[PDB]
């Protein structure tokens, strides 16, 4: 019984149905996420053949213990819904609100955050999972540990090397081949969204709001940004997918060198 193991609190987040909670067994803070069956896009089968939302399949595949992706602790099926018990770091703030309040981030801080997101996305891919909705809204900052967590696998898919023709992530983070042709490959689409995210961090908001900007191929910098950072962003935002860097090329890029540790990041920029 779910009503027995957890103390449920008020709504959580910053739209959706995620509630604050505490696990009674040990007062562990949790996030209790409800997903209505009639609203589920993709379904998956578990090992025992039980039909679950794909989000549960993907969360189980990444739930090893690497701290950069949100951990699914448990889940329950109800007549009309599924309930996901997720870890809840505290104190946290999502990266969207963090950037809103602080404006464009110092490049040392953006480098630390971007590096952690890259490591989290690599973990997903290594576990066979494509997130498909990388954006600042889906990134939580543990303000005491300086550790970022990727959340909300509700738009994700199993990672494959063939073409994707479906998409339900965030359009202003989606790549021009999706806008133009309704198709994309997983890794190069992820790199595009990471380019959007990095611009967001160093400029204080995303570069594109309209389809014509997404496909237009021009990146205007509204804030002072180093030449090395600009180059990496423009490379991630290459119009042709095959022109975009691999994850290895991103992390070997000159702008990415000498990253801060999470604890250094917390002490320098968050405390």
């Amino acid at each position: 019984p779910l009503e027995s193991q957890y103390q449920v609190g008020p709504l959580l987040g910053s739209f959706g149905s995620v509630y604050s909670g505490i696990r009674v067994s040990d007062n562990l803070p949790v996030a209790i996420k409800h997903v209505e069956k009639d609203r589920i896009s993709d379904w998956g089968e578990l090992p025992n053949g039980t039909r679950v939302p794909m989000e549960v399949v993907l969360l189980k595949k990444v739930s090893s213990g690497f701290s950069g992706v949100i951990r699914l602790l448990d889940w329950f099926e109800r007549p009309d819904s599924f309930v996901l018990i997720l870890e809840r770091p505290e104190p946290v703030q999502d990266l969207f609100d963090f950037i809103t309040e602080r404006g464009a981030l110092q490049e040392e801080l953006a480098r630390s955050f971007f590096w952690q997101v890259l490591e989290a996305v690599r973990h997903c891919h290594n576990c066979g999972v494509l997130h498909r909705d990388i954006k600042d809204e889906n990134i939580l900052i543990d303000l005491n540990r300086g550790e970022l967590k990727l959340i909300d696998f509700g738009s994700g898919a199993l990672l494959k090397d063939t073409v994707y023709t479906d998409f339900d992530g965030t359009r202003v983070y989606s790549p021009p081949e999706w806008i133009r042709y309704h198709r994309y490959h997983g890794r190069s689409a992820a790199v595009w969204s990471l380019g959007i995210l990095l611009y967001d961090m160093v400029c204080g908001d995303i570069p594109f709001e309209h389809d014509e900007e997404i496909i237009g191929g021009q990146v205007f910098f509204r804030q002072r940004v180093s030449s090395e950072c600009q180059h990496l962003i423009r490379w991630c935002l290459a119009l042709r997918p095959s022109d975009r860097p691999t994850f290895e090329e991103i992390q070997n890029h000159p702008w990415m060198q000498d990253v801060l540790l999470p604890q250094e990041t917390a002490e320098i920029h968050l405390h």
Binding site: F96, T100, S155, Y173
Partner: peptide, 8 residues
């Protein structure tokens, strides 16, 4: 200028 969230 207006910064906003974007639904999925």
């Amino acid at each position: 200028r207006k910064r906003r969230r974007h639904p999925s």
